[PDB]
Assembly symmetry: C3
Homo-oligomer: 436 residues x 3
Amino acid sequence: AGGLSQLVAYGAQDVYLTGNPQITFFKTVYRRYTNFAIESIQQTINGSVGFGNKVSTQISRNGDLITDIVVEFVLTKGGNGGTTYYPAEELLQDVELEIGGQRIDKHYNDWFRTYDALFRMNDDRYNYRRMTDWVNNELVGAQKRFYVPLIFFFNQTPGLALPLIALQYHEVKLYFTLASQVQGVNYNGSSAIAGAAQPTMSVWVDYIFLDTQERTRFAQLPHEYLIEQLQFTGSETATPSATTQASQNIRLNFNHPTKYLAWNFNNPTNYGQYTALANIPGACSGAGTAAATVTTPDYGNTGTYNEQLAVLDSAKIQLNGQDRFATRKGSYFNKVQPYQSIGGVTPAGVYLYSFALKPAGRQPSGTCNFSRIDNATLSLTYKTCSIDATSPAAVLGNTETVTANTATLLTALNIYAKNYNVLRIMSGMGGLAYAN
Amino acid sequence: AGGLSQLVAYGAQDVYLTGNPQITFFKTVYRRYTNFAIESIQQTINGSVGFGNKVSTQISRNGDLITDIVVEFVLTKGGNGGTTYYPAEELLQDVELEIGGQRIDKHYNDWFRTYDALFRMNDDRYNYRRMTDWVNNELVGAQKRFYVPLIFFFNQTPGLALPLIALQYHEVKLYFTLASQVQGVNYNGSSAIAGAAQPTMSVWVDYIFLDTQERTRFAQLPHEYLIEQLQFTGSETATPSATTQASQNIRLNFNHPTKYLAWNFNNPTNYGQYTALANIPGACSGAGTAAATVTTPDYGNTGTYNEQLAVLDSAKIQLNGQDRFATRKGSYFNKVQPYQSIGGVTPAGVYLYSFALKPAGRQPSGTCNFSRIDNATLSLTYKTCSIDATSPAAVLGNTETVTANTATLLTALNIYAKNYNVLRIMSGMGGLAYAN
Amino acid sequence: AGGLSQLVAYGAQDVYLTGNPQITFFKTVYRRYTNFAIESIQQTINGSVGFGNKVSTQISRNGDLITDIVVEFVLTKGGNGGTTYYPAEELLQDVELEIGGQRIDKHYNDWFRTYDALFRMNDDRYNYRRMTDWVNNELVGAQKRFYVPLIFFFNQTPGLALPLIALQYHEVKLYFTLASQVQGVNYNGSSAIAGAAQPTMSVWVDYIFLDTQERTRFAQLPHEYLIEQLQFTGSETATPSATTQASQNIRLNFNHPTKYLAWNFNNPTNYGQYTALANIPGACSGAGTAAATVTTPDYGNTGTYNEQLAVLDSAKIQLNGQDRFATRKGSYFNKVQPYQSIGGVTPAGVYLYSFALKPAGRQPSGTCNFSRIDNATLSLTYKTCSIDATSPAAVLGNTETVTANTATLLTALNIYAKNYNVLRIMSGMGGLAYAN
Ligand SMILES: *[C@@H]1O[C@H](CO)[C@@H](O[C@@H]2OC[C@@H](O)[C@H](O)[C@H]2O)[C@H](O[C@@H]2O[C@@H](C)[C@@H](O[C@@H]3OC[C@@H](O[C@H]4O[C@@H](C)[C@H](O)[C@@H](O)[C@H]4O[C@@H]4O[C@@H](C)[C@H](O)[C@@H](OC)[C@H]4OC)[C@H](O)[C@H]3O)[C@@H](O[C@H]3O[C@H](C)[C@@H](O)[C@H](O[C@H]4O[C@H](CO)[C@@H](O)[C@H](O)[C@@H]4O)[C@@H]3O)[C@@H]2O[C@H]2O[C@H](CO)[C@H](O)[C@H](O)[C@H]2O)[C@H]1O
Ligand SMILES: *[C@@H]1O[C@H](CO)[C@@H](O[C@@H]2OC[C@@H](O)[C@H](O)[C@H]2O)[C@H](O[C@@H]2O[C@@H](C)[C@@H](O[C@@H]3OC[C@@H](O[C@H]4O[C@@H](C)[C@H](O)[C@@H](O)[C@H]4O[C@@H]4O[C@@H](C)[C@H](O)[C@@H](OC)[C@H]4OC)[C@H](O)[C@H]3O)[C@@H](O[C@H]3O[C@H](C)[C@@H](O)[C@H](O[C@H]4O[C@H](CO)[C@@H](O)[C@H](O)[C@@H]4O)[C@@H]3O)[C@@H]2O[C@H]2O[C@H](CO)[C@H](O)[C@H](O)[C@H]2O)[C@H]1O
Ligand SMILES: *[C@@H]1O[C@H](CO)[C@@H](O[C@@H]2OC[C@@H](O)[C@H](O)[C@H]2O)[C@H](O[C@@H]2O[C@@H](C)[C@@H](O[C@@H]3OC[C@@H](O[C@H]4O[C@@H](C)[C@H](O)[C@@H](O)[C@H]4O[C@@H]4O[C@@H](C)[C@H](O)[C@@H](OC)[C@H]4OC)[C@H](O)[C@H]3O)[C@@H](O[C@H]3O[C@H](C)[C@@H](O)[C@H](O[C@H]4O[C@H](CO)[C@@H](O)[C@H](O)[C@@H]4O)[C@@H]3O)[C@@H]2O[C@H]2O[C@H](CO)[C@H](O)[C@H](O)[C@H]2O)[C@H]1O
Ligand SMILES: *[C@@H]1O[C@H](CO)[C@@H](O[C@@H]2OC[C@@H](O)[C@H](O)[C@H]2O)[C@H](O[C@@H]2O[C@@H](C)[C@@H](O[C@@H]3OC[C@@H](O[C@H]4O[C@@H](C)[C@H](O)[C@@H](O)[C@H]4O[C@@H]4O[C@@H](C)[C@H](O)[C@@H](OC)[C@H]4OC)[C@H](O)[C@H]3O)[C@@H](O[C@H]3O[C@H](C)[C@@H](O)[C@H](O[C@H]4O[C@H](CO)[C@@H](O)[C@H](O)[C@@H]4O)[C@@H]3O)[C@@H]2O[C@H]2O[C@H](CO)[C@H](O)[C@H](O)[C@H]2O)[C@H]1O
Ligand SMILES: *[C@@H]1O[C@H](CO)[C@@H](O[C@@H]2OC[C@@H](O)[C@H](O)[C@H]2O)[C@H](O[C@@H]2O[C@@H](C)[C@@H](O[C@@H]3OC[C@@H](O)[C@H](O)[C@H]3O)[C@@H](O[C@H]3O[C@H](C)[C@@H](O)[C@H](O[C@H]4O[C@H](CO)[C@@H](O)[C@H](O)[C@@H]4O)[C@@H]3O)[C@@H]2O[C@H]2O[C@H](CO)[C@H](O)[C@H](O)[C@H]2O)[C@H]1O
Ligand SMILES: *[C@@H]1O[C@H](CO)[C@@H](O[C@@H]2OC[C@@H](O)[C@H](O)[C@H]2O)[C@H](O[C@@H]2O[C@@H](C)[C@@H](O[C@@H]3OC[C@@H](O)[C@H](O)[C@H]3O)[C@@H](O[C@H]3O[C@H](C)[C@@H](O)[C@H](O[C@H]4O[C@H](CO)[C@@H](O)[C@H](O)[C@@H]4O)[C@@H]3O)[C@@H]2O[C@H]2O[C@H](CO)[C@H](O)[C@H](O)[C@H]2O)[C@H]1O
Ligand SMILES: *[C@@H]1O[C@H](CO)[C@@H](O[C@@H]2OC[C@@H](O)[C@H](O)[C@H]2O)[C@H](O[C@@H]2O[C@@H](C)[C@@H](O[C@@H]3OC[C@@H](O)[C@H](O)[C@H]3O)[C@@H](O[C@H]3O[C@H](C)[C@@H](O)[C@H](O[C@H]4O[C@H](CO)[C@@H](O)[C@H](O)[C@@H]4O)[C@@H]3O)[C@@H]2O[C@H]2O[C@H](CO)[C@H](O)[C@H](O)[C@H]2O)[C@H]1O
Ligand SMILES: *[C@@H]1O[C@H](CO)[C@@H](O)[C@H](O[C@@H]2O[C@@H](C)[C@@H](O)[C@@H](O)[C@@H]2O)[C@H]1O
Ligand SMILES: *[C@@H]1O[C@H](CO)[C@@H](O)[C@H](O[C@@H]2O[C@@H](C)[C@@H](O)[C@@H](O)[C@@H]2O)[C@H]1O
Ligand SMILES: [Hg+2]
Ligand SMILES: [Hg+2]
Ligand SMILES: [Hg+2]
Ligand SMILES: [Hg+2]
Ligand SMILES: [Hg+2]
Ligand SMILES: [Hg+2]
């Protein structure tokens, strides 16, 4: 009886499962690895740290490899609860990775927002906001230390750790541009906050110290790294109409085998506003009260999952004038494409089309070579922004192809593409195999 | 100092960890794969799309393999906030997969509910409800597009992608039965909603386009696929008593090496009602107010994690009249079995017993061959449904082996079993190795 | 067009991705494994089950291997909503694993709390609280069955399943110490709850039944298992000042290759209180009301993510009087270290420093050999606990290096280290390779 009686229940169908076993689940043999040690070491920042200033850092050569890099910010609130939306993230307006004077990759604050909306999830995503925002209803004057993790290729997996020991004659530098205006810190809307403190900045790089055997191999041998890059093109959204469905074709200027496309429609006035402001809880300042105004967002709750507030009705991609796939609704690129390939949840206003089975995985799993495509076009059709944004009854009770009239503020269209490339390192110098 | 001083701290105990390294964490070699492309292509639906109608689709032969399949529904609300509970999921009452006239698998809406409660989790599970329900407090008349992803074997992993190119002489068809009554869409309780719109349906299949090398291999070579199937038997729950603990033995008519058993006790009147209605927040219409009534649920919040509202007190399985394991409480099959083998959270009223170490994984990891068992029995003991469901003090303050008196409405008992089988494909035809 | 036109877009850059394929994503070959069966079997408990009592269990030899072990508790509430905080977890004050009279590992209730805060996440972590607490606003007299899963080496992965069949001459025993006072069960603060029921205890061990081939191998062959252990040292926190920043150096008495360090500052009066009590929602009894008192916590909401309520300002580790790394703020060890190596979220007051790339993984990925270090020191600097804890305006609006004046109650400092060891099993006896 019990367990033993099930073992005896053996038949011909078990041959496909347990006939002549190859593995066992009850005796794992663990792999032995190369000895190493990790140390997070502070870097020197060249230039004056302040709003709207450009600063740079040349990575010191303390260890053999480098992996994670974190930027530390200390900021002080200028408003009360819900008046900030990822201020530390917005503050890092853009960050450039350079090896031997050659640009390897460059990221932007809006990419950090889009990456977080697509590829982070669950408690990890909430911990990320803890690192970049006030999430405890803090008031005016609250001061907090923030941690912005970089997400370049060697930051995302130790298997791509950048070998400083093999880059003897090439310096590795990071160029930072700090934002000038950050909501809830030094600016409230367009009015500056008097007495707002300048930010203080610190840069920390995690180093790997290798044993003698592997150290000598890294220094003497040539290396090839399959790395990822970011491509970004900022376009102007066609003005959506309250009487007709506007359309638009954007020529895609991308290169290299590309894993996926990701785009959003954002209002440049408000960081992360990817959807239309409306008079429903969390969609505008003072929503559901006598002070409701759809001109100003509920900053702490700028994001939403309500597809009704998204502006894109349908979209498709064309290759040399032919449909790459049949037109799908905007919700397909927001819900189904992340469901099929990511497995998290993406707020409305952020869209994905994946060429890869696993776009979040480092291992390649399907790409499109945009370097071999003469014409690539993103065809867009917008909803009819005819809903009264001040009426919750109208916003919460409407049809698929209409949206709030405040969608006309979503004037900026940001399209991102994540591609692969090869970083060859030999004779103390690094270089990308393909420029375009 | 720092990192380097830890490397020198080397001893005899490090031999088991780093002595003669086999792997390194800092130089990942990625695998090269076969070139391919994905395209989601719309299918033709034969038959009239409407409530209570049967429609079918014969998969067109555009590509070499097929993977994901999504059913698109457009629906209009008939009620306000919290008056729908997975309407798009319920609408797809059952879906049958057929290859060459032979049934390969068949799923049901209640299986989608049970699968979601057991194997989906976190943001992925919330994104799934976004695809199948209104989650933004929408009002009467709100119209939304829904996406119901199929979960047959080739839908769940690209490694089991169905090769249409190798099924030249066998058609692959899907048979859909649409529900007749869906709460919050065309029916409110048992009263039809006047002017309710018929649903519109669309079926999309993702195709894989293979390169010439692999294309020829798939078309000429014989193939064997280790696939999964669903077995379902619907039984009548024994009437639980308010004065004694009712018991019941259900003979299990299952076959094949089975990964796990999953069952629920549901009230057929309400979709997904797996627990007793009670006068506590979220457990009945107007709970905690003067309009509270335990005859009608809070539809938007039909599920619960409160074990007190579950009807099963204890259960065990018997093999040929002998205990397969000692009796455990119903909470064990709801909490511990998912904890030990799934790692998510399952609402009360859904129970699991796993024969596998990893029942959610496609790779087999332990099964029981129900084809070699003459008698398999699920022995059940029910709680004494003697709690006053209208009293929150009684519901929120009671003992282990009692439940709310409204548990007598949980009359339907659905038992599911997930088994393995072999799909052999050769000479343009597919066929299952084992029928029973 | 469509998918097929992308396949033709092939170039020289695709050689690194798809040139001469090694793998395919569309034909997974699953591994065949050794046949087995699982059975959860109840154990005998020696000694009287009660608050403050020590009981033990000698594992019966029903099967070949053992894996998961769960302790079942039945408890009755003595208070209303939010008056319990993981009572089943606290009740299991400490549990010792012993093989042949030799201690293999020993865990504590505070380790369960710290482990849950660091390595559990998402729905799994919420399901764990369902197994160890009331989470449905239950009132006085509610009785619930709880499940405390053990987390020794063979409990966490079946690949380390303890082979009873190979331990013929060594008994495997578990020694439990039950807590004497549990908030919300038999004690309210320091006042006992009259008529509180003694707990009832049950111990269940999951057995693996092996087939003849593998059974004989396990019984005759020598075995080596790479297992993990817990090291714990309890220290007294230096009294933090409201006028200066107190500091403290703790000599670390640890051994073996250690994966990570984890520590907290807790108030022994309240289970899991890792942060200072304050007059903000969820931080003290009756917070935000006329009955607010920072002397008593909101038990149901004892944890927090608000770094302001944490007492540690900065910390670093020293090796033989030299900095192992540069000083970082306490939030770094609470936010960044879990972000970089765990990927969840950790409440404030729990700190991590990892020597491993993946400290939650069983496969070793970097350790420090504390057996080869003569002096290891944790250097601590505390915040100035000068904030008026009774003032929400002061707590929610302050600077980085200050905390609430109630932080002086965080007098206990618990430091944990997770190390590796080798369990050798031969001739029917088990033994650890290294004692220190
Ligand atoms: C994003 O989503 C989150 C999750 O829903 C929101 O948080 C929730 O808000 C609703 C709460 O019920 C829930 O508990 C909370 O989780 C978030 O809302 C915004 O941020 C929260 C923290 C609130 O801000 C706090 O609001 C209270 C203010 O305190 C003042 O309140 C006055 C009524 C008192 O007279 C005055 O003395 C202040 O309070 C005292 O100090 C506070 C800190 C103590 O807690 C309190 O003790 C109890 C007093 O000390 C003794 C805080 O300064 C502020 O940080 C939201 O504010 C809304 O909800 C409050 C419950 C309500 O009181 C607020 O009304 C006040 O402010 C509005 C203007 O905002 C005035 O018109 C009104 O007269 C009153 O003064 C307000 O309804 C925040 O939301 C608001 O501001 C946002 C800014 O982006 C946005 O504009 C939003 O639409 C607004 O609703 C969401 O951002
Ligand atoms: C499942 O769990 C969710 C999470 O807890 C619940 O959502 C929460 O509900 C409590 C809120 O505090 C919280 O913000 C919310 O997240 C969910 O509850 C159900 O769905 C929500 C969205 C509510 O429904 C909305 O309720 C308000 C209705 O609006 C009318 O309200 C009247 C008071 C006004 O006079 C009238 O003008 C309407 O409002 C106007 O229109 C709305 C859309 C605008 O927002 C409002 O502007 C502020 C007005 O415009 C100017 C909406 O139609 C409806 O969709 C829950 O309703 C409960 O909570 C409300 C806060 C409260 O107002 C409700 O009372 C009204 O309805 C009840 C009957 O339902 C009447 O008896 C009462 O007189 C009043 O008219 C109500 O207490 C929903 O819950 C209810 O219905 C459920 C149906 O399955 C179920 O029966 C449940 O027990 C009910 O409580 C949960 O389902
Ligand atoms: C941790 O975080 C959780 C998430 O925020 C909290 O839960 C939330 O609490 C706020 C709610 O709005 C929200 O819905 C809920 O999710 C949690 O709070 C604690 O636990 C919850 C469940 C509440 O406890 C319940 O509170 C109501 C009590 O019922 C009595 O209420 C009286 C007003 C009635 O007169 C009396 O008849 C009782 O109610 C009747 O019985 C209940 C069960 C029925 O539901 C009710 O029907 C509607 C009546 O039956 C007809 C329950 O016994 C108790 O379990 C929190 O309590 C706060 O919030 C309540 C909404 C409010 O009513 C409470 O006030 C009562 O108690 C306080 C003292 O606690 C008295 O001073 C006051 O006069 C009144 O009697 C109270 O404000 C719980 O929080 C409190 O207790 C904690 C103990 O650790 C802690 O001390 C905390 O600070 C307190 O606020 C959080 O723990
Ligand atoms: C947690 O956070 C909450 C906010 O999120 C805090 O509440 C805020 O407090 C400020 C308010 O403006 C705001 O509305 C409120 O949200 C909370 O603080 C404590 O709780 C509140 C409710 C206050 O308690 C009340 O204090 C007044 C007492 O009444 C006496 O007042 C005298 C002036 C009269 O002379 C005397 O007769 C009393 O009044 C009478 O009796 C009361 C019950 C009747 O309602 C009233 O009717 C008109 C009178 O009837 C004859 C109340 O009993 C008590 O409940 C906070 O108290 C502070 O703020 C008050 C506005 C202020 O008046 C208080 O000063 C009085 O008490 C102090 C000692 O506390 C005396 O030294 C002084 O002479 C005066 O008597 C006081 O500044 C509470 O905060 C105090 O106590 C806390 C611990 O309980 C804590 O120690 C804090 O630092 C103290 O400030 C937070 O706990
Ligand atoms: C989508 O957005 C548009 C633009 O914002 C919005 O239309 C605006 O609605 C407000 C109105 O003042 C503006 O003129 C209009 O542009 C639309 O709302 C819905 O469609 C419009 C055309 C109205 O429908 C018409 O109602 C009157 C009725 O005689 C006529 O047959 C019908 O077509 C909206 O109805 C609302 O506004 C009317 C002015 C008002 O009279 C209505 O009250 C009647 O009906 C309600 C129930 O709907 C009864 O409770 C009441 O006693 C009375 O009979 C009503 O307030 C309509 O919105 C309303 O219906 C939709 C679904 O069709 C949703 O449920 C809304 O929540 C609900 O307000 C948006 O859908
Ligand atoms: C489980 O479900 C059952 C069935 O619904 C429920 O019993 C129902 O309770 C309501 C009552 O009207 C029905 O007859 C009964 O079927 C049960 O509740 C609990 O058990 C019953 C037997 C009552 O206990 C008895 O209370 C009276 C007392 O003299 C006697 O010694 C005791 O056994 C429930 O107590 C409630 O209902 C009584 C009618 C009422 O008099 C009680 O008030 C007294 O006690 C309360 C505190 O419990 C005092 O605040 C008050 O001043 C007075 O002294 C009380 O309302 C009992 O429920 C109560 O206790 C349980 C735990 O035992 C829970 O905390 C409840 O939340 C609480 O209401 C359910 O447990
Ligand atoms: C951190 O904790 C400390 C200790 O708890 C706390 O200081 C306590 O604050 C309360 C006060 O009674 C105690 O003496 C003090 O120990 C600190 O709060 C902040 O710093 C102190 C020094 C005060 O600043 C001073 O305010 C008066 C002003 O003339 C002077 O220039 C300024 O330095 C706190 O201000 C509060 O308490 C004062 C007694 C009161 O007069 C203030 O009201 C004035 O300012 C407020 C806005 O700040 C106006 O709305 C009001 O009309 C009036 O002009 C005020 O209540 C100061 O806290 C206040 O400011 C900080 C940021 O500096 C936060 O926003 C607080 O939320 C806010 O209350 C804690 O930061
Ligand atoms: C969106 O459509 C709404 C309904 O017509 C308008 O109310 C709104 O106009 C804005 O707000 C109103 C109140 C007026 O002040 C307008 O001048 C303003 O542009 C539209 O944005
Ligand atoms: C923390 O600092 C607060 C502000 O000074 C004090 O109120 C608090 O003192 C406690 O509470 C007050 C109300 C008094 O009762 C004190 O005796 C008590 O110690 C400090 O803990
Ligand atoms: Hg393309
Ligand atoms: Hg418009
Ligand atoms: Hg079986
Ligand atoms: Hg009953
Ligand atoms: Hg060390
Ligand atoms: Hg202090």
